[PDB]
Specification:
By secondary structure, the protein is α+β, with helices and mostly antiparallel strands. It is built from 4 helices and 7 strands. A hairpin with a 5-residue loop joins strand 2 and strand 3. The N and C termini lie far apart (31 Å). Its EC number is 2.3.1.183.
Length: 165
């Protein structure tokens, strides 16, 4: 099972570790090389009460995944628009974790005052694209080959959903 709670400083290590476990597959992150906790300390502390980072613990209390809400643009005009990022420990892939995490993210979002929620997913990540599309997200954009890794170009798709009635 999985239980969500607000992230804490001592979680940074596990959060980065999960992030790094996904780099190899080059299916969700824009990094080709593993990063260090120090390289992400800013991003980590950058979360707020309205745009938080949540971690999900397995039945053993170990952080197995996380959900991050981030600002779209540091401008009041975009205050009700946010990005949602979900990373799962590569070792937990293929267990239905994604579905549960997205559902929780969506339950939480409205209470954060978020009206429009967007997700940045690589064009070749069909599983993630299908998951979001089953939950009300539509493709709002496709930025062709703007990501380059291993000498290959990748497309970035932007999926969005308006939550507010």
């Amino acid at each position: 099972s999985l239980t969500l709670r607000l992230a804490e400083h001592r979680d940074l290590e596990a959060v980065v570790a999960i992030y790094n476990s996904t780099i190899a597959s080059r299916m969700v992150t824009a990094d080709t090389e593993p990063v260090t906790p120090e390289d992400r300390m800013e991003w980590f502390s950058g979360h707020t009460e309205s745009r938080p980072l949540y971690v999900a613990e397995d039945e053993n209390g170990n952080v197995a995944a996380w959900i991050s809400f981030e600002t779209f643009y540091g401008r009041p005009a975009y205050n009700k628009t946010a990005e949602v990022s979900i990373y799962i420990d590569e070792a937990c892939r293929g267990k239905g974790v994604g579905s549960y995490l997205l559902q929780e993210a969506l339950r939480i979002a409205p209470n954060l005052g978020i009206r429009s929620l967007m997700a940045f997913i690589f064009g070749h990540n069909k599983p993630s694209l299908k998951l979001f599309e089953k939950h009300g997200f539509a493709e709002w954009g496709l930025f062709p080959g703007i990501a380059e890794m291993d000498g290959k170009r990748y497309d970035l798709k932007i999926l969005g959903r308006e939550l507010s009635e």
